[PDB]
Amino acid sequence: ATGQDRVVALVDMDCFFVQVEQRQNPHLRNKPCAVVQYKSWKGGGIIAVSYEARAFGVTRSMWADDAKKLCPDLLLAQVRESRGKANLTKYREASVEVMEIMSRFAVIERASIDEAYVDLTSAVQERLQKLQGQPISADLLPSTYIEGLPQGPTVQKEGMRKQGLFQWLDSLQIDNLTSPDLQLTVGAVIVEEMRAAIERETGFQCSAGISHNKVLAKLACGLNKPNRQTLVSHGSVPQLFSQMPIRKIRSLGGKLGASVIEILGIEYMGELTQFTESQLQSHFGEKNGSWLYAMCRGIEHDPVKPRQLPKTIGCSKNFPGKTALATREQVQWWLLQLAQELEERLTKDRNDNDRVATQLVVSIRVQGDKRLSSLRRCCALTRYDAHKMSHDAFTVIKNCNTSGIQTEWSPPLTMLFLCATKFSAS
DNA sequence: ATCCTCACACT
DNA sequence: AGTGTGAG
Ligand SMILES: O=c1nc[nH]c2c1ncn2[C@H]1C[C@H](O)[C@@H](COP(=O)(O)OP(=O)(O)OP(=O)(O)O)O1
Ligand SMILES: [Ca+2]
Ligand SMILES: [Ca+2]
Secondary structure (H helix, E strand, C coil): CCCCCCCEEEEEECCHHHHHHHHHCHHHCCCCEEEEECCCCCCCEEEEECHHHHCCCCCCCCEHHHHHHHCCCCEEEECCEECCEECCHHHHHHHHHHHHHHCCCCCEEEEECCEEEEECHHHHHHHHHHCCCCCCCHHHCCCEEECCCCCCCCCCHHHHHHHHHHHHHHCCCCCCCCCHHHHHHHHHHHHHHHHHHHHHHHCCCEEEEEECCHHHHHHHHCCCCCCCEEECCHHHHHHHHHCCEHHHCCCCCCHHHHHHHHHHCCCEHHHHHHCCHHHHHHHHCHHHHHHHHHHCCCCCCCCCCCECCCCCEEEEEECCHHHCEEEHHHHHHHHHHHHHHHHHHHHHHHHHHCEEEEEEEEEEEECCCCCCCCEEEEEECCCCCHHHHHHHHHHCCHHHCCCCCCCEEEEEEEEEEEEEEEEEEC
């Protein structure tokens, strides 16, 4: 079981929110620019950064005022605000554009607002039969890198890419319709078409990874950005993983990746191969150890889920520091703002996707607590009605109020969160 | 004071 | 049902 059964692609829009504003505002194209939300505090937090601005070291999470110190000619687009909070509608809608184009080629899994996995196994099969037995020309792959090539016995980047592609296509066994390397190559030709279709029909540029599973696809995608795709073959994995830091593989970027590194005394993904599956399972659990055992050999079976629609519709606002909501009527007003956006997006969903949400999830944070949420509670969602939702949300969080007064809210609320979930066909 | 999101595992 | 992790 070499884990070469499937062809999987991960497509990822290049600096997506920036492109969305650059498409709409041509003055911003091919310039250092970023997208920010909320202008008042330190110029606004940066959530997306064009590749021109990145070369000055501008990053996400920075304050816009500080980014202007790194890049004085940085241009800024501010996220729409509605009802006193950020409104992402323009980007969800531009996201819909991209998901619908990709869905014309294969079944996709929406992984985030701007990336989708594609299972190309079947599409590659059909294309292999229409392809008689004729060779794959390099012109079919004008923006594809083959990771690990060129090797063996040109100083500029496009030169390297071409030499690597040529070495790869020279040794392609195009007479064997079951060689896994042929299938990825044909998968990559389809992804070139997918990416040309996206750019022509939206103007949005993107990168893609093509491999045999989701984690290699995602890893491959970020090896050659922007506006390029990378094929990571099963055979490339030992050299690729030998110096790949663990935290770079999807889901090892957090506490678990930190435990793998610490407990085992290792640094790179390839070092995991020296351990038995029983050993990995003993340190990290049955499923995490089985998964680590196979993943460090480049094998993973997580399937491409057929799901293009989010499972939850959510809507939240932080109230940091001195702004924490300390009165009962303050908490009521913002729950109404939240419910009002929620209601408007839910009714778009019902009309667009023939489904209804049946459960309302209310979360709050409390000043003094350490974590994202401090409490989560749930009631029934029977009506796309902003007042009822916010009345029901208040009902189910009223007793969190440690205050003895009735008009006050102690401890003050630092976050409000409303989430419709548990959708059913309608 | 990166804010606002979404999926999923664990219990 | 509620919590926590990991990601965009
Ligand atoms: O913390 C965040 N808070 C609010 N919004 C965020 C956040 N993190 C990412 N986002 C939004 C904007 C980003 O454009 C889009 C895709 O995210 P993401 O793929 O990670 O980065 P990106 O498309 O901007 O650049 P790139 O893929 O070329 O590295 O998600
Ligand atoms: Ca992405
Ligand atoms: Ca992206």
